[PDB]
């Protein structure tokens, strides 16, 4: 039943992403405007090379594309996860450097702003996304007579300890891709929220309407990410760990039945990122609307 649902869901997030982040990239061509642009590139690159896996899931084992694309597309989808999480966290730390300590922290924002953070986060993304194409090949399994895309973990290690290799890789990616960046983002936005609550006086006549918009946007900014990138790594490591200690049959089956959906939930944030970071400040609203209405006719 999900065999057509998963591809349709992938297509729905593709249409959404290549629209939202496309418009963001068009309108952005202020500090924290490099990070918006970098975030927009990750969303467009992240969802554009999906229709290949969209078509592939339709048969669940038939991969009607080159062996090479099982390397390029997987490398793109991994480098983009890491770049998008790393950039979004760098964006929150820049906000912290600029809003909590605006006087004593001028030098650090001069050094580790979008000038160096962009290059270093992209370098770390590419450097951590190596084992996704080094170890990934293609094989036509005689048990299905269908050319499937899969990983070997044999091109580097011995098969005698393959369980430890997969455990280590699975634990390491979540630790470097969701644990540290999410903690950093949570700390930065906790301190920015303390500052916003401290500076904007509540005992004012229609002056606190600047205190609920900002606090709400901070809470949404943390919760969207905490509720998108969490179930994926949750189920992933839950399955990779429980299947190794001691597990039943109604647990593992549910995990395998729900993973092709937890891997579709982590693709909606990629589409939400514009409507939370870029089209939230009314500056892009006016410029983007003027640009979208200039050359486009008044009659559909």
């Amino acid at each position: 039943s999900s065999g057509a649902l998963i591809p349709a869901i992938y297509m729905l997030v593709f249409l959404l992403g290549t629209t939202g982040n496309g418009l963001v990239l068009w309108t952005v061509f202020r500090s924290a405007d490099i990070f918006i642009a970098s975030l927009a590139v990750a969303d467009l690159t992240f969802v554009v090379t999906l229709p290949l896996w969209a078509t592939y899931t339709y048969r669940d084992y038939d991969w009607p594309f080159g062996t090479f694309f099982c390397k390029l597309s997987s490398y793109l989808i991994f480098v983009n996860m890491y770049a998008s999480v790393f950039c979004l966290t760098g964006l929150s730390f820049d906000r912290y450097l600029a809003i909590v300590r605006p006087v004593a922290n001028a030098r650090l924002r001069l050094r580790v702003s979008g000038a160096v953070a962009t290059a270093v986060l992209w370098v770390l993304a590419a450097l951590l996304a190596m084992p996704v194409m080094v170890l990934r090949t293609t094989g036509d399994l005689e048990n299905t007579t269908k050319v499937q895309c899969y990983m070997d973990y044999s091109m580097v290690a011995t098969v005698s300890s393959e369980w430890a290799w997969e455990v280590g890789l699975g634990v390491s990616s979540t630790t470097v891709g969701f644990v540290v960046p999410f903690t950093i983002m949570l700390t930065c936005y906790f301190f920015i929220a303390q500052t916003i609550a401290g500076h904007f006086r509540k005992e004012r006549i229609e002056g606190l309407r600047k205190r609920r918009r900002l606090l709400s946007i901070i809470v949404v900014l943390v919760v969207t990410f905490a509720l998108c990138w969490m179930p994926y790594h949750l189920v992933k490591t839950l399955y990779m760990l429980g299947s190794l200690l001691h597990w039943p049959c109604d647990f593992d089956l549910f995990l395998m039945n729900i993973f092709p959906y937890c891997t579709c939930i982590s693709y909606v944030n990629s589409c939400l990122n514009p409507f939370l970071y870029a089209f939230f400040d009314p500056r892009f609203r006016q410029a983007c609307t003027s640009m979208l209405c200039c050359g486009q006719s008044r009659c559909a």
Partner: peptide, 13 residues
Amino acid sequence: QRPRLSHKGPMPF
């Protein structure tokens, strides 16, 4: 059933 979870999605780990 203990299949690899990397041959169904676009993310191996």
